[PDB]
Amino acid sequence: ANLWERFCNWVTSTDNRLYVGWFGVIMIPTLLAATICFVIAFIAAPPVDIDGIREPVSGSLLYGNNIITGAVVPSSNAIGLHFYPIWEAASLDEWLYNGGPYQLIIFHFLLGASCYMGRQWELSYRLGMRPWICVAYSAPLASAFAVFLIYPIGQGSFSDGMPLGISGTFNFMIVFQAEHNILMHPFHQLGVAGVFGGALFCAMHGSLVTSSLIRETTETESANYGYKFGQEEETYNIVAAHGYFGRLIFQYASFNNSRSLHFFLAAWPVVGVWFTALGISTMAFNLNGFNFNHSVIDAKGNVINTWADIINRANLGMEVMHERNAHNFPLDLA
Amino acid sequence: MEVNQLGLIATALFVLVPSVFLIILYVQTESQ
């Protein structure tokens, strides 16, 4: 054992309170940089000219935001997709005005989070586990890539990336509806199905295992004290929960293989969230939601509005008001 | 920013009162 090997063993040690890992050797610095830049910027960054029209948007607390309205504001549209590291600016004052912190944070963050995924694989290998938790995390990771990288690439600017704020996130959702009619896109409908049903099945599983917990405590103590960490036996009667739940609907609508039951819980929301991340990724290239505007017309040819035309009226309200000083020509093509 | 004066006292007690409850309950659990 020499210097390199002692280090290699520390890095991949399964005795560290927090696993490090080769993926962690990248994740730790990139996440730290992003987290420190994000916190300073959120509190103190001065206004950022997000839309490139010399009209700065104040995102930080010290400049009169609160927790809900504050943000790290995306980098200037004048920058488009150009790389804007600190060293490319003439002064930090220039880097701040033009929104450099958003580039630094998102790049370090996306790098950091891709290696988090990798680190989940890595530790599972050292622990003797099956490897695929990192596959589940890939649904939220891709989702984040979609709003922070892909959608900017398709539209040619990080100025149309998702802002790092609570209200900025809403701005981003609203403008998206106007430009892509995302509600009418099947992949986002799959993501709603992803998350409603993931919440639905999460209550169902909690409610059902909780229902069939085996008495092991008295009325005064928490029932939680009837499980002991590491115990070999199960704390609940799955036969009984299948018996409740098979009758609630019918016998075959109900799982009786615990393995089949948990793979279903993993698979449902992960798939759904893959699809909505893909929906954001593809609407990045302007393949938008179904367009049924004026799809119904009468014998003479008058337009017979459906609910889709009513959506489109709201969409148009979003369209004409958003970024109200930034368009000189009549189509908003990116 | 012209914010609410009572907002500070409402926020502070909102944190302080329920937190102290939990702290009282936890420390006397430990000492028995």
Partner: peptide, 30 residues
């Protein structure tokens, strides 16, 4: 004053992270 309040509460949560991880109840194999 409201800036200070937002940041104080943020900072309290970060300290809570530190203790919840490093001064957790250790899980024991009983």
């Amino acid at each position: 004053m409201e800036t200070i309040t937002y940041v104080f509460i943020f900072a309290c949560i970060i300290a809570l992270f530190f203790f919840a991880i490093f001064f957790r109840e250790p899980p024991r194999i009983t």
